[PDB]
Subunit: 74 residues, 10 copies
């Protein structure tokens, strides 16, 4: 029983951008009304209730590598 785990990974992620100019985020907010009474969350819940919200994201490169290696022997 011989298991050889040898992932040869050569990877490059490259973003080339000269200049990012005028980014204008001007939003006139509104109205959010939320009515509830009983909220039950047990395990690993991500919940946003009644949000007015503004996200301006300007990453120079925004590159993301996700690598998962799982080996299980039963």
């Amino acid at each position: 029983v011989q298991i050889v785990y040898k992932p040869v990974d050569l990877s490059k992620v490259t973003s080339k951008c000269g200049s990012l100019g005028n980014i204008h985020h001007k939003p006139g907010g509104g109205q959010v009304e939320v009515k509830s009474e009983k909220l039950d969350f047990k395990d690993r819940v991500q919940s946003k209730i009644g949000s007015l919200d503004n996200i301006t994201h300007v990453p120079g490169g925004g590159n993301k590598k996700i690598e998962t290696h799982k080996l299980t022997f039963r």
Copy 2:
């Protein structure tokens, strides 16, 4: 019983952009009204209830590699 796991991966993701000009995000917000009473979430729930929301995303390159390697021996 011999298992040879040898993924030779050579990968390149390349975005070339000179300049990003005028990005204008001006939204006049409105009205969101949500009525509930009983909310039950058990396991691994992602829930957005009653949101007014504004996302401006300007990544220079926006490149994303997702690589999953799973080996299971039963």
Copy 3:
């Protein structure tokens, strides 16, 4: 019993863009009204209830490679 897993992968994703000009996202928001009483979510639910929402996405290259390698021995 010999299993040789050798995926030779040479892949390139290339986006070349000189300049991105005027992107104008101006939306006049409206009205969203949602009435419920009892919401039950058990496992791995993604749910958006009562959203008014504005997404401006301007990636320089927007390239995404998804690679899944699964080997199972029973």
Copy 4:
């Protein structure tokens, strides 16, 4: 029973950006009204209730590598 875990990983994430110009985030806030009575959270809950909020994120490069290696022997 021999398990050889040898992931040779050579990876580079590169963002090149000359200059980031005018980023203007001016949002006129609105009104968020949330009414509840009983909230029960047991295990590992992330919950935002009644937020008006403004996030301006301008990372020079915004590169993120996530690598998970899991080996389990039963």
Copy 5:
């Protein structure tokens, strides 16, 4: 029973940015009203209730590597 855990990891994350110019975050705050009575949180809860909040983040490079190596022998 021989387990060889030898992950050879060579990784570099590089952000090159000349200059970051005018970042202007001027948000006119609004009104958040939240009414509840009974809140029960047992284990590992992260909860934000009734926040008006302003985050300006300008990291020179914003690079984050997350590496988890887990080996369990039962």
Copy 6:
């Protein structure tokens, strides 16, 4: 030359209303964009240019009598 101006005016305006119930004025505002360069107004001009506006008027009786008496001798 005899001019007898004797307007005998007996007038009554009567509004009887028991109760005015739920008046709900919730309008999600939109977007108004107006471009001009040269505006010339000489005498007695009433002008509204580029307005987004909300008027809720609930008078208990809203009764209006307009009486003009003009006598001119040339």
Copy 7:
């Protein structure tokens, strides 16, 4: 030359209202953008340029009598 100006005016304006209940004026504001360069107003001009505005008027009776008496002898 005899001018007898004798307007006998008996006038009553009557509003009877028991109770005025729930008046709710909640408007989510929007966006008004007005561009001009040269504005010339000489005599008796009433001008509103670029307004976002909210008027809630709840008079108990709202009764208005306008009476103009003009006599001119040339």
Copy 8:
């Protein structure tokens, strides 16, 4: 030449209101942007330029009589 100016005016304005209940004026403000360069106003100008504004008026009776008597002898 005899001018008899004798306006017998008997006038009553009456508003009867028992109680005025819940008046709720909650407006989420928006954004007003006005660009001009040269503004010339000579005589008796009333001008509002670039206003975001909220007026809540709840007079118990709101009764207004306007009476103008003009006599001119040339």
Copy 9:
């Protein structure tokens, strides 16, 4: 030449209100941006430029009589 100016004026303005209840004026302010360079006002100008403003007026009776009597002999 005999001018008899005898305006017999008997006028009563009456507002009867038992009680004025909950008046709630909660407005989430927004953003007003006004750009000009040269402003010239000569005679009797009333001008509001770049105002964000909140007026709550609750007069018990709000009754206003305006009476103008003008006699001119040329």
Copy 10:
């Protein structure tokens, strides 16, 4: 030449109000930005430039009589 100016004026303004209850004026202020360079005002100008301002007026009776009597002999 006989001018008899005898305005017999009997006028009463009456506001009766039992009690004025909860008046709540809570406004979340915003942002006002005004740019100008040269302002010229000659005669009798009333001008408000760049104001954020909050007026709560609760007069018990708010009654105002304006009476102007002008007689001119040329």
